[PDB]
Amino acid sequence: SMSVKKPKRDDSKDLALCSMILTEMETHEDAWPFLLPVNLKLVPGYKKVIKKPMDFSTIREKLSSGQYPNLETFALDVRLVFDNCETFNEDDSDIGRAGHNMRKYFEKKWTDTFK
């Protein structure tokens, strides 16, 4: 509360560390469905159904331009990518499986880096 603060967590490396995680997600062999924005002209149903599209290239640009106020807003957009994928793709599809795999890969790196 006013003039009453928990001890200051060092957040000075968060930007660099989020960037390194994102590099590791970008280079994973199952990243291909997620690298670029879904083409809303060419994929029927996507525009109407997926209210907030997100992809790695869009996260990279937001990261690089100071549009994440903290590491939690960064994680929310990564998770959005996988939540969208689950909304639109059957579990038993290449893309469906890719999204489960990448979500797992992310959550481990997140816990190991920050928790």
From Swiss-Prot:
Superkingdom of origin: Eukaryota
Disulfide bond annotation, renumbered to this chain: none
Localisation: Nucleus
Domain Bromo residue range list: 9-113
Entry comment describing in which tissues the protein is expressed: Expressed at varying levels in several tissues, whereas a smaller transcript was expressed specifically in testis.
Family named by the database record: Belongs to the WAL family.
Quaternary organization: Component of the BRF-1 ISWI chromatin remodeling complex, at least composed of SMARCA1 and BAZ2B, which regulates the spacing of histone octamers on the DNA template to facilitate access to DNA. Within the BRF-1 ISWI chromatin remodeling complex interacts with SMARCA1; the interaction is direct. Component of the BRF-5 ISWI chromatin remodeling complex, at least composed of SMARCA5/SNF2H and BAZ2B, which regulates the spacing of histone octamers on the DNA template to facilitate access to DNA.
Function of the molecule: Regulatory subunit of the ATP-dependent BRF-1 and BRF-5 ISWI chromatin remodeling complexes, which form ordered nucleosome arrays on chromatin and facilitate access to DNA during DNA-templated processes such as DNA replication, transcription, and repair. Both complexes regulate the spacing of nucleosomes along the chromatin and have the ability to slide mononucleosomes to the center of a DNA template. The BRF-1 ISWI chromatin remodeling complex has a lower ATP hydrolysis rate than the BRF-5 ISWI chromatin remodeling complex.
The protein's name in its UniProt record: Bromodomain adjacent to zinc finger domain protein 2B
Source organism (scientific name): Homo sapiens (Human)
Lineage: Eukaryota, Metazoa, Chordata, Craniata, Vertebrata
